[PDB]
Each structure stands twice: as C-alpha cells, then as structure tokens.
Design a protein around this ligand. Structure first.
Ligand code: GD
Ligand code: GD
Ligand code: GD
Ligand code: GD
Ligand code: GD
Ligand code: GD
Lengths: 169, 340, 68
C-alpha cells in the first residue's frame, strides 16, 4: 500500500483519475459511483468454505484454527460448558448462523477443554471470541446477557452485525 | 552570479542544530512514565444509528458543536446535515463536484462549508436556507485542490490546499486575509487549537507546522515521519496534537517539547493512516487506515485498546462529538454509523 | 494588517524564507519531554474515568439509546 489512494484527499484524487481512465479509455459520474461500491463487495465476498459449527477439543486445536486460517476469514469461537444457562440457546443459534454465513468459520469448545480452567468460570460463560487475520477482534464475556432469556439466531446475528463482525451485504 | 547549493546547506546544518536541541531534552518516552498506569478495558463500541441517504462513497464528515447534528460529504455530489438522534435528514445540498475532499460545520450551526478538486471552498448559509440553489460564498484563490477546512467563527475560515498553502479567509469580503506558506508539499489536513488562536497542519513534505492565526506565520515545524502526513488532530488541552501518515504510524507531538512524545504502530499494520481523532479525555486515539479499517489506541500506553467497526473494511472517515458521547463513521457503501 | 502572498516567488526566495524560519525555530526554548509526559499522563488519567468512550455509557444516560 504505502501511499494512500482510497481515503481522504488522496482518495478523491485517485478516484477522479481512475474515473477518466474509464469514460474515454453526470451519467458517467453515477455509473462510476455504483462501480466503486460494486468493486468492493466482490473483493470482500469470499468463497463459502464452511456451513457447520466445528467442535474443538483441546487448546492446541483452538490455537491451530486461528493460526492456519486465511487472514481474510472471520472466526467466531464459542467457549461454553453444558448445563450452564444460555449455552444451549447460543449453540442452537450458531448452528443456524454457520449455515447462513458459510464464509465465516464458527467453532465451540468447553471451558474445561481450553487449557485454562478457573480462568473461565460459569460467571463469564458463555464467552464468545472473534478472530480475523490472526488477531482477536472482539471478546464478549457473558454473551447470553446481550439477549433476552429466550433468544434465537436472528438475535445473535443482529448483535454481531452491530459490532461489524458479519460480512456480506 | 548568485548562489544556491550553499544556501541548501545552511538549511541542513540548521535543521541539524534543531535536531540536537531536541535530542537534548529527549530523556524519556511517554510510555516509560505510563508503565504503571492500568491499560484501558477492551474498547468495543456498538452501532446505535445508521444514516441512510447517500448514493455513493462518503468522503468526509464533521460533527456540529451540539453533538447531534452532523454533516457528510459524498461522491454523490451531496452534502447532508443529519440529526444523528433520529437518523432524520435536516438539509440536503446539491454540489457541483463529486470530488469533495472535505466539509465543515461552523460552531454556530449557521453555516457549513466543503471543497475538493474544484480548488474552491464553498460556504452555505443554513439560516437564510440555501439548500436548493444558493451558495453564500465561493472562496476562490488556491491553485491546488482543497484538502480541509475549519471555521474559526461565522466570518473566518481556514483552508489547507494541494497548492502547498493554507489560507485564512474573511467570509464576508471573500478575500484571502492571510496566507500561510512554508510547506514544501501538498497540505493534506489541518486542526484548530481549541482557543482558535493557533492551528496545526499536516502536509506531504512529512512535516507538521504550528501557525499563529492572528499573527499569520509559522511558529514551529515538527518532523519524525519519513512519509506524508495525511491527518492531524489537536489534543483536547491544546498543548499537543496527533498525526497519521503513509508510514503506517501515528505520532503524538507536544508543542512545548517541539518533538514527538510517542509513536503508535504495529508490525501487522502496513497501511497508511488517513484519519485520526481523540476521545473526550484524550485517553483514546482513533485511527482510520487506507484499507478502510479503524484501530483504537491507548494514548498513554501506546497499545491497541480495540478495533472500531470490527475490521469490516467499511470505514472511510470518522469523527468524535464535542461531548465525547459518540463516534461517527463514513463508508464507501454510502452509509454512516454512530457508535457508543 | 494581515499578510497576503501569491506563490510565484523563485526557488531562492523560498530557500531564503526557509533558513529564516529555521533560525527563528533554533532560538526556540524547549521543555524536557519528561516534564511534558508527566503533564500528559496527568491530564488524561484524571479524565479518562469520565470519558464516555473509555468507561461506557449507562443505557439511560445514552443519547443514542435504542430508539423508542
Ligand atoms: Gd438472517
Ligand atoms: Gd461497549
Ligand atoms: Gd440495535
Ligand atoms: Gd512524499
Ligand atoms: Gd493529578
Ligand atoms: Gd491535574
């Protein structure tokens, strides 16, 4: 990247330039405006590699999935423990979400299997961690609290979307 | 015959002297003194409002002093005054160019300006109601594009330009009252000190200049970046300011020290910074990168405190309210968002 | 008497002005970064506790509360 070319003045300058390379190379203005936005979804829309919530059984596995993943893929990891309220509902929601956002990798793991026992008490469970490009993008302790007792996939989605964590349109 | 090559050397030796004067007070970095300060909690802001109305990429926006109304300039050649609380549109102003680089909101709310590749700074009176045809004043003069502008009040506005200059105009007469020359490169941005007696500017010569408005000349020239400075913002107490540049680093400059107190960067970050803004207390430094991502920095500890907009590559510009209650983001997909 | 100035000067006219400014800047008395940092840390730490974007806003005291 180095020199900027998409935002701020630099952005206007380069947008104006790329504009000319197209009209001769008001009506041409509007077409360009649509083409820029269009030109972006396509690059941000990647292949639907998944569709299911995968279970991680050990800490090594957790570390391996975020590490070896393509830097463009968003990874939603769910840390839970059976019996603990909210977990089941959240897991149900994730199964439906994973199926709607195939380009987003969804995972789940028992707090016990993490390799960090006490660190994850039922008090902070379920905890929802979200990675992307190898770095942690969000960390939601007691996620279940962000919704009403009875919550479904569409609620978890609205929620993730308002933190800008889900792709496509 | 006269001479220049030698005159090119007195400049470097002098710069050389200033470097030493600075290096003489550089006993410690800010992070050193803040090493015991508790890091802030993970900053995670959420979308509260979505402003729908623009039909193209959003280039720049600016909050009104009431922390409720806000203006947005878009590639759709429109200027929109919104009411962030209700997401309702208050004004909509047709522009002549789609290439708007900046837009400003007078602290009084009576006016609003904008400009871009038209080398002109257009001013609109919102009270006389020039929404449809009228354009109060067109400030002509710069021989380069208009990068940024900020009102000092209703009859005074400062502009930065690609022509290497910055100008202080008298809205009424429409004349370029003062001319701030000195940069050797395109001026990309400017920031008014809170008291409006001083203002700072970033340019493509890799320097930031402190200017005296009332006196019309450069007080100091800051350096450190090896690349273009694309954004600059004054710190809340007026004694420092931040810069974002193509070298993928943010820098905190203190005015009294005449040098950088700290730098913000990470190895995973490789894009230029084209946007910077402080939180109300100044504890947070928000940075917009050319890859449409936004990072939230802990001004004190120099570590990422968070990510704004979850790295969805949808942030083209941003701004924080005077009351420090919310942040606004512009996007290439035509939507603006408010975050708490 | 504000100063108006056109940019059709010569390279030398700019270089001149450059060394002049540089000299003024050299005569500038600076403060120890240490003293500056102490004041920066001080200003921010005592105010970050009231910073809305740092601590978070109680839902009732939030102007952008879930619209109803
Ligand atoms: Gd859905
Ligand atoms: Gd929050
Ligand atoms: Gd909402
Ligand atoms: Gd440069
Ligand atoms: Gd204190
Ligand atoms: Gd104090």
């Amino acid at each position: 990247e180095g020199q900027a070319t998409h935002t701020g003045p630099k952005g206007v300058i380069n947008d104006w330039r790329k504009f000319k390379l197209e009209s001769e190379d008001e009506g041409c203005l509007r077409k360009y405006r649509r083409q820029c936005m269009q030109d972006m979804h396509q690059k941000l829309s990647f292949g639907p590699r998944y569709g299911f919530v995968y279970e991680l059984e050990t800490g090594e596995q957790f570390l391996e999935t975020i590490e070896k993943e393509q830097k463009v893929t968003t990874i939603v990891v769910n840390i839970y423990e059976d019996g603990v309220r909210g977990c089941d509902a959240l897991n149900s929601s994730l199964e439906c979400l994973a199926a709607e956002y195939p380009m987003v990798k969804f995972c789940k793991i028992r707090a016990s299997n993490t390799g960090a026992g006490d660190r994850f008490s039922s008090d902070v469970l379920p905890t929802l961690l979200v990675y992307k490009g190898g770095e942690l993008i969000s960390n939601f302790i007691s996620v279940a609290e962000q919704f009403a007792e009875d919550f479904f996939a569409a609620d978890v989605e609205s929620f993730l979307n308002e933190y800008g964590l889900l792709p496509e349109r | 015959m006269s001479e220049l090559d030698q005159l090119r050397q007195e400049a470097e030796q002098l710069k050389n002297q200033i470097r030493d004067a600075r290096k003489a007070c550089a006993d410690a970095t800010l992070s050193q003194i803040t090493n015991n300060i508790d890091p802030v909690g993970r900053i995670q802001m959420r979308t509260r409002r979505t402003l729908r109305g623009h039909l193209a990429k959003i280039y720049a926006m600016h909050w009104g002093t009431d922390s409720r109304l806000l203006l947005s300039a878009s590639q759709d050649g429109k200027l929109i005054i919104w009411d962030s609380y209700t997401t309702n549109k208050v004004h909509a102003i047709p522009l002549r160019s789609s290439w708007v680089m900046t837009c400003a909101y007078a602290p009084s709310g009576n006016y609003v300006a904008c400009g871009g590749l038209d080398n002109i700074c257009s001013i609109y009176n919102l009270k006389t109601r020039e929404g449809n045809v009228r354009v109060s004043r067109e400030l002509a003069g710069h021989t380069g594009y208009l990068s940024c502008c900020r009102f000092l009040d209703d009859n005074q506005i400062v502009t930065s330009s690609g022509d290497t200059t910055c100008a202080l105009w008298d809205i009424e007469t429409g004349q370029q009252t003062t001319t701030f020359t000195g940069h050797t490169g395109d001026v990309m941005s400017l920031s008014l000190a809170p008291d409006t007696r001083l203002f700072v500017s970033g340019a493509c010569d890799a320097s930031a200049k402190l200017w005296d408005v009332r006196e019309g000349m450069c007080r100091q020239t800051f350096t450190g970046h090896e690349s273009d400075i694309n954004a600059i913002c004054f710190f809340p107490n007026g004694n420092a300011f931040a810069t974002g540049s193509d070298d993928a680093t943010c820098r905190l400059f203190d005015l009294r020290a005449d040098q950088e107190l700290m730098t913000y960067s990470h190895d995973n970050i490789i894009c230029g910074i084209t946007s910077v803004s402080f939180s109300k207390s100044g504890r947070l430094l928000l940075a917009g990168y050319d890859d449409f991502n936004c990072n939230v920095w802990d001004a004190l500890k120099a570590d990422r405190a968070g990510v704004l907009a979850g790295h969805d590559n949808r942030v083209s510009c941003l701004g924080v309210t005077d009351d420090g209650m919310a942040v606004a983001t512009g996007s290439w997909d035509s939507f603006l968002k408010i975050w708490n | 008497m504000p100063v108006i100035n056109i940019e059709d000067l010569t390279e030398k006219d700019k270089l001149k002005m450059e060394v002049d400014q540089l000299k003024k800047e050299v005569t500038l008395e600076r403060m120890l970064v240490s003293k500056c940092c102490e004041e920066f840390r001080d200003y921010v730490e005592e105010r970050s506790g009231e910073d809305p974007l740092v601590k978070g806003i109680p839902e009732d005291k939030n102007p952008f509360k879930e619209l109803k």
